[PDB]
Amino acid sequence: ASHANINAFKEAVTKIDRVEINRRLELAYAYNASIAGAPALKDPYSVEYARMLEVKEQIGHVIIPRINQDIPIYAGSAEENLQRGVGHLEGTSLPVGGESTHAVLTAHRGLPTAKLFTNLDKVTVGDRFYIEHIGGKIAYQVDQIKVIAPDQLEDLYVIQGEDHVTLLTCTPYMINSHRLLVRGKRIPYVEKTVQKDSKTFRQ
């Protein structure tokens, strides 16, 4: 079902005019610029703000090759969304990258019917993950892995001059008393070449 959703997003994007894509991206950049220029983030584990990015109800998908996950991203972190894929944390930057952006994406550390971010503990610094949105695919390299208590969101705010994405889930596995944050930093990337990115192959 999720992979069906991803295929739907992909096909749909191909049918969109490039000038149309670009206008919508500009809306997202502007949105992010307001966040960067400015709070009230709330832990999802106890919407239309991103409409410009939405295609087939999704704002894109996140790929994490080390653990072979490819999961659709939905705007907002309502439990309804977290039951079917990754949620984007409202109040954080939209996941299209850029100077002074920090997008936060979250998923359950396992559900009875879906692995989701179950194996996120196996990602190590230097591993890479990727976000495909309406404008193409961007890459991040993990630079920081952190465990925090549920009431600390300071790590989730924008860092001026920088381009980050944090993958947020609960930990330890089957306990979920804390939050695991796997953060990446933007790196240059162009898809569909002979490039191989695994840390094993690298560098």
Author numbering: 42 to 79, 86 to 93, 102 to 258
What does the paper say about this structure?
The pilin subunits of GBS are assembled into high molecular weight polymers via a transpeptidation reaction catalyzed by specific pilin-associated class C sortases, through a common mechanism involving specific motifs present in the pilin proteins. The pilin-related sortases, which are integral membrane cysteine transpeptidases, cleave the LPXTG-like motif of the pilin proteins and, via the Thr residue, covalently join the C-terminus of one pilin subunit to a Lys side chain (ε amino group) on the next subunit. In this work, we present the high-resolution crystal structures of SrtC2 and SrtC1 from GBS PI-1.
